[PDB]
DNA sequence: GGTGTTGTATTACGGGCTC
DNA sequence: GGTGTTGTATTACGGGCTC
DNA sequence: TATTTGTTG
DNA sequence: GAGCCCGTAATACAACAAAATCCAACAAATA
């Protein structure tokens, strides 16, 4: 039960094979590509096709007619003759030692994008699927605020359990919100610690139940506060707070190495140390990014001046304007530097309407659902809206899934074939 | 690791778990990779069948029925750190060469086979729970026949010569249909051994090119202090997960230091350099108490704690402004007088 | 008057050989790959070249300059020095043990691709041979075995007639039916055969085997029912049960199902009456035994260490006795 | 003695044409 | 509307010397 | 001799 | 080109990516 026991006088290679035969030319519809290929063969000298008793082949490899292309690549890709659904390299190593197939690599990668199980099972670095495209930089001071918290720490005396952080996107000002892992009184403690400065414009946070929080969201809609609400298991958007708790974790380890179970005393020292230390992407201390009144003043900084903003009373407007201008251009510099050092391999994905994208078992099933060697056979979903440049909402075929926003790091767009 | 030998005299194996049960078989991955030819066998099993006592060796031998190895490379798993396993392998003349306390990169080629196995397992795992134990031999037969990248030949034909049935003989020669008289197999099988050996120097060079570009070697002599930073105490978030310095004893490799993390307790006191870090004590430091009365008065100048000796009653801890690794023994006669309320806090 | 007696200071190997010299770097156009290779040699660990009186060479191979690559391939490929235009396997077995040649295999296959004299009609799609290797197997059934406290009262015999290899393994005599081909498929480390010539009794199987072959790519049909050849192979099949009876005579608790793979190992680790060699090294290199260390029970750091190697030695004596009895049976009968 | 390692899309380099 | 982001050893580029 | 308790895929 | 000192100063590279329970199973410690 072997193949190639069939003559085909109507295919692309007929023009190539009549270079010796010159007998019959029964071309088909859309066979004008064969005419152009024969013209290119005529103006060049690459004649290596061998014609031996109906076996027309290349120098050592069997050229296959285009009628049975899919049959051959399915035979050497599926388990009919022990393929195994591998990549283009193993498929070439199975086919190219035996067959030639002009533009074989493009045909094989097209088949990889065609075969459904390879789309659902393979990953092929599904963490580089969209550009960086960071947050818009800022406005006037204390208008954008980043919100997140680490769920659990070694508990203190039974009054405090975990640390919440507030750092603004502009100035990156540390904060010490020590919660109890909380209730609807989140707005009480949160209000007491941001309203020390004032009400922001948008909150960059995750889809956490203390902030998804239909009771708390309506408060923000009434008050005039937006909510970015980073999607399920995509904590990258929170950013400044995540980077702060990275710096806080080192600081908390430093100040509580031998002093576990009472770190709530040292937490204001943690935030004050974070506040007094200059950063890199802005080059100035977060006091200086705000009203520059580093109160410790161990020594005067470089370019010695008055450096006493307490003496200035009415002229603070020009000083804050100057700080705002230089910090805004520094934020733009940080944005472009991040975009340069990150997008060296980040391939974009821009669809925005009418596709059948997937979600490869991350933010689709539960974060608490165990990942194992169980098959990854998420069905072909649909996309109806372009919610952002780096995400697309889906019509999750479930009860509700409680969210339908999927960042591009889980999509891996499905492609059909007739 | 050393390149190759005479058809899997060097071998690797490892375990991964998390597989769904079918007949109470939630291990099912005992993958053994014939390192030279990369034949990469894996046989279904379970956690509760054996713990290297009764039946684990039996299918280990039915695998080894097709040729005894000469070198194992495995992990620090409890199924192979047992006294029964090491001694039987020593009487078999086969080394152990275990890993370095959560350093699975020693078993890299077996784990890379698992990485290839997992994709094929998901491909064949549509009947996840009902009936799928027939798929592991199918996955074996598919994976062995598929050509690899680092050698250009399928691992099935590297050792056995020929390919499996339904010949799809390539345009090289008829040599891959070698199923005939066996007196001349030695010459061309050794020729293929030379081919594959050359492909493995190419593979070792390719691995060392793109990985050593950023990596920097660490060079320590015996005697100098070293920090372990992990795998010393298994709520490790705010507390001092990183522990104090220890004295290195045996330098097995340039990236393998044997050190005295505790007194004499347990579990294979060699740590890979990835966890290891240099220690520098360039520095009013105090002196070394050696008298009997200096261990009682100078007990409130402590800094950290290691733990309690399991063999007898002797606590090991760190003092302040002294030699860090060279600890001073503090028994119970000078332990209860000082406030120990803040001592067990860093141990818990 | 032979090769390597010429100065070639402008090639790829110059950057590799200037790791200790560092004298002159007379590169060519687009030779920045050579500087990258020297940087690679600096940042990696492959430095084993020996520098003695212009003889730069690897641990056992003399490197060759890239300029006379055509000269080397013509010398070691054509009939200039009694060649014959062999395949890539023989050519690389001839060239590689003597010279290092970075990217040698690709050089050889590229020369094969760019040569014209050898490329003739070679013939066709697949090999045709009635005698092979693992392409024809036979099996039989046995009955009287202990329950082994796990209902494993059967032994599954498999024969490898093309190479005289064997596979004996414990099963259950009640149901050797889908579980039979499951363990057959985990047995199939060496591919499907062409035909199975069991010829033991009536076989209601080979229908689901046929469905398996339809689900797969091989046409392995199971046939040869109620045949009668009876020329030598019948003696081997009859004597097959003798070794299993000897394994039975050992014990019943922790019996032959323990260390029966070792029974097979030193059962086929012996030459077949000196006419044919052992099945391990008739195909593989040797599949070494390594029994050298057996008496070290002083400390060991009757069921763990001692009795295991006593049972191994007992199995070795048993197979020696079986070999003696079959050779004396052949001497008396013939 | 004892310590990574290949599968995979993706992309870079020679014959043959226009020069 | 809504989607990364800084801390850190490490390393690359100008004044001043030898030319 | 059963119930513990260090460490590790 | 050719290298060196020194003084700034950019620069990819990885960590924040919820936290903490055991599972199965080696061998130490009493009583």
Author numbering:
A (entry chain A): 17 to 197, 201 to 437
B (entry chain B): 151 to 384, 389 to 437, 440 to 504
C (entry chain D): 17 to 139, 148 to 200, 203 to 327, 331 to 363
Give the exact sentences the study uses for this entry.
Ty3/Gypsy is a member of the Metaviridae family of LTR-retrotransposons characterised by a highly defined targeting pattern in S. cerevisiae, integrating in a narrow location 2–3 bp upstream of RNA Pol III-transcribed genes. The minimal factors required for Ty3 targeting at Pol III genes are the TFIIIB subunits, Brf1 and TBP, whereas TFIIIC is essential for directionality of integration, which occurs in a narrow window of 2–3 base pairs (bp) upstream the transcriptional start site (TSS). The Ty3 intasome is a pseudo-symmetrical tetrameric complex, in which the four integrase subunits are engaged with two Ty3 long-terminal repeats (LTR). Two “inner subunits” harbour the two active sites, placing in close juxtaposition the reactive LTR ends with the target DNA and are each associated with an outer subunit.
Following a process of hierarchical classification, we obtained a cryo-EM reconstruction of the Ty3 intasome engaged with TFIIIB and the target DNA at an overall resolution of 4.0 Å. Analysis of the structure reveals that a phosphodiester bond. has been formed between the 3’-end of the LTR reactive strands and a cleaved 5’-end on the target DNA, confirming the activity of the assembled complex and suggesting that the majority of the particles imaged by cryo-EM correspond to a strand-transfer complex. The integration reaction takes place at position −6 (relative to the TSS) of the non-template strand and position −2 (relative to the TSS) of the template strand, which would result in a 5 bp target site duplication (TSD) after a final step of DNA synthesis. Interaction of TFIIIB with the Ty3 intasome is mainly mediated by the C-terminal region of an outer Ty3 integrase subunit, which stablishes a novel set of contacts with the convex surface of TBP stirrups and Brf1 cyclin repeats. The SH3 fold (residues 369–433) of the CTD of an outer Ty3 subunit establishes direct protein–protein interactions with the H2’ helix of TBP C-terminal lobe, positioning the Ty3 intasome upstream the TSS. Topologically, this TBP-Ty3 interface overlaps with the binding interface of TBP and the RNA Pol II-specific transcription regulator negative cofactor 2 (NC2)49. The binding of TFIIIB far upstream (−15 to −32 bp) the TSS constrains the positioning of Ty3 intasome active site also upstream of the TSS, ensuring that RNA Pol III-transcribed genes are not disrupted by the integration event. The structural data unveils how a newly discovered chromodomain in Ty3 integrase mediates histone-independent interactions with Brf1 and the downstream part of the target DNA, acting as a “ruler” that safeguards the integration upstream of the transcription start site and prevents gene disruption.
